[PDB]
Amino acid sequence: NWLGGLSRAAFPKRFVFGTVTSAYQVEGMAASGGRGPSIWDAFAHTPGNVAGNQNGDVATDQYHRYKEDVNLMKSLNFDAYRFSISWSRIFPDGEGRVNQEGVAYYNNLINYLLQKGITPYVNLYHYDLPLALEKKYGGWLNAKMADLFTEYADFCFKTFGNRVKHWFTFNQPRIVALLGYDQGTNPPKRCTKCAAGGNSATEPYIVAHNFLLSHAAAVARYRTKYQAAQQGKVGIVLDFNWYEALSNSTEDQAAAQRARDFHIGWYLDPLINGHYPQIMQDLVKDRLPKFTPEQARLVKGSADYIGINQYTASYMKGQQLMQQTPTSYSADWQVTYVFAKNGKPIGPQANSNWLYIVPWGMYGCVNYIKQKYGNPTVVITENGMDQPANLSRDQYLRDTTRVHFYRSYLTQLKKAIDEGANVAGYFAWSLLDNFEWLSGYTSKFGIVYVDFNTLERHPKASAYWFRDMLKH
Ligand SMILES: OC[C@H]1O[C@@H](O[C@H]2[C@H](O)[C@@H](O)[C@H](O[C@H]3[C@H](O)[C@@H](O)[C@H](O[C@H]4[C@H](O)[C@@H](O)[C@H](O[C@H]5[C@H](O)[C@@H](O)[C@H](O)O[C@@H]5CO)O[C@@H]4CO)O[C@@H]3CO)O[C@@H]2CO)[C@H](O)[C@@H](O)[C@@H]1O
Ligand SMILES: [Zn+2]
Numbered sequence: 001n002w003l004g005g006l007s008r009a010a011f012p013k014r015f016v017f018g019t020v021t022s023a024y025q026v027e028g029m030a031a032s033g034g035r036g037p038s039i040w041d042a043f044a045h046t047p048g049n050v051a052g053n054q055n056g057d058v059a060t061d062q063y064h065r066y067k068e069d070v071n072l073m074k075s076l077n078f079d080a081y082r083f084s085i086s087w088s089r090i091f092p093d094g095e096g097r098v099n100q101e102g103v104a105y106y107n108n109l110i111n112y113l114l115q116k117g118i119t120p121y122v123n124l125y126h127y128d129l130p131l132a133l134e135k136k137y138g139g140w141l142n143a144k145m146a147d148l149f150t151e152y153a154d155f156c157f158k159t160f161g162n163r164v165k166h167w168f169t170f171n172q173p174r175i176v177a178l179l180g181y182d183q184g185t186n187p188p189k190r191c192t193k194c195a196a197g198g199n200s201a202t203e204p205y206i207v208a209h210n211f212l213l214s215h216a217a218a219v220a221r222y223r224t225k226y227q228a229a230q231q232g233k234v235g236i237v238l239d240f241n242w243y244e245a246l247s248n249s250t251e252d253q254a255a256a257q258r259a260r261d262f263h264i265g266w267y268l269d270p271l272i273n274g275h276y277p278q279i280m281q282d283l284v285k286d287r288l289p290k291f292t293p294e295q296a297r298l299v300k301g302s303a304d305y306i307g308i309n310q311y312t313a314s315y316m317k318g319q320q321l322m323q324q325t326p327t328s329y330s331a332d333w334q335v336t337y338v339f340a341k342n343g344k345p346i347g348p349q350a351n352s353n354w355l356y357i358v359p360w361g362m363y364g365c366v367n368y369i370k371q372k373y374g375n376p377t378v379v380i381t382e383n384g385m386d387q388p389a390n391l392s393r394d395q396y397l398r399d400t401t402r403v404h405f406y407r408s409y410l411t412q413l414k415k416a417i418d419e420g421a422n423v424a425g426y427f428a429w430s431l432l433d434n435f436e437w438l439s440g441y442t443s444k445f446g447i448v449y450v451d452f453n454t455l456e457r458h459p460k461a462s463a464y465w466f467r468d469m470l471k472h
Contacts, residue, residue, distance in 0.1 A: 036092025094130030255318025313361030
């Protein structure tokens with residue numbers, strides 16, 4: 001059977017299923033309704049930055065259509081919806097004056113969700129730093145971001161927190177650090193060679209440190225001011241792809257473990273244990289900022305749950321560790337990526353070149369966190385795959401590969417949960433085809449097809465798969 005034995009009965013009582021979007025990727029009205037620009041508006045409006053010179057000005061127009069989209073998610077039997085608030089739609093300059101029209105939108109969206117029995121899971125930040133803060137403060141390079149972010153979070157808690165009980169601060173700070181400040185391919189386009197300036201060896205570490213301090217400060221504000229009355233939770237969303245040793249050699253096993261530590265441990269060791277991974281301290285040395293005892297104690301235990309975005313897996317090959325002139329965060333790991341073993345690829349690729357379909361990576365990641373970090377409450381906050389550009393509507397709708405993807409990945413998630421992993425929920429990326437950052441509209445991740453000419457929504461086979469799997 002096409003469900004392959006999956007249903008709500010196959011998961012724990014009260015396990016949460018949802019779909020996910022992010023503000024810039026779906027809302028549209030990017031320069032309307034009082035919204036100020038983000039670093040993504042500026043970046044996407046520069047010729048050559050995004051596929052087809054596309055941008056999120058209109059995107060899926062969820063701003064106008066949100067009731068349609070909520071009706072659709074309810075009809076597909078989801079329990080929850082993860083979306084983000086655009087900082088610059090609330091505070092067009094990132095601080096100071098509140099855009100009341102922006103506030104009204106999120107009130108309307110949250111209220112409709114609740115009216116329809118869909119639980120809002122709300123991200124405060126999803127790459128979309130207000131342009132004004134980038135220009136005035138230097139963005140995430142500036143330790144002052146902790147104060148600026150805390151003040152924004154405080155406003156959101158006060159304004160929405162009587163209704164919203166599930167918050168996330170950040171989405172994938174690793175990718176902000178990597179793409180914004182190591183490779184310089186996402187805004188602010190910083191790197192050692194980059195026109196904007198930068199230093200691929202130092203800035204990714206400064207940026208990560210500031211995300212951690214900002215998360216901790218926002219959570220401290222929630223707990224001391226709002227939580228007694230509101231009784232909600234705040235976590236963080238971190239990407240984690242699985243790393244498997246290419247062989248059972250000491251060097252390959254060490255390499256895979258180094259990759260895990262530089263990828264997820266970078267954030268989870270501070271959040272769970274109050275320090276960076278030992279290997280990162282050993283290899284990165286004075287380029288890795290030091291938490292004071294007070295900061296470390298603020299960061300430790302500051303996530304009520306850990307969101308994990310899980311997509312893919314790689315093999316890892318290792319080498320003797322060597323003294324080397326620092327060049328970048330990526331090069332600091334001293335590992336070699338490998339995508340085949342015994343002459344067989346680890347899995348076929350989706351439309352995105354980085355996205356290898358490897359369902360057992362889901363089990364890898366979930367098991368690893370359970371065993372290493374004392375089984376923290378985890379929520380799978382994104383999982384999904386993409387179709388390419390230029391298909392016909394019907395080809396988009398017959399998304400047989402995506403159906404297989406969800407059945408296989410969720411089977412592997414079920415295996416990990418059945419072995420005792422503390423996973424509380426699962427969210428599909430994405431509800432809708434949307435603006436996929438550098439890929440623009442050339443990458444289709446949705447379980448619902450969006451015709452980008454007419455803006456019409458049409459559920460794909462994977463949407464109906466979820467509907468069948470999730471019927472109550
Ligand atoms: O995209 C859907 C949805 O997901 C969330 O964010 C995504 C994000 O959009 C993607 O950009 C990001 O992609 C990263 C991959 O997950 C990650 O595996 C990949 O790793 C690179 C690595 O950075 C790179 O150094 C490495 O290069 C090696 C070469 O492969 C070798 O041949 C060469 O010899 O050596 C170099 C380095 O030693 O390769 C791998 C790629 O295979 O990096 C990607 C970024 O480039 O994934 C995110 C999720 O993990 C987001 O929430 C949503 O908004 C978004 O729409
Ligand atoms: Zn519209």
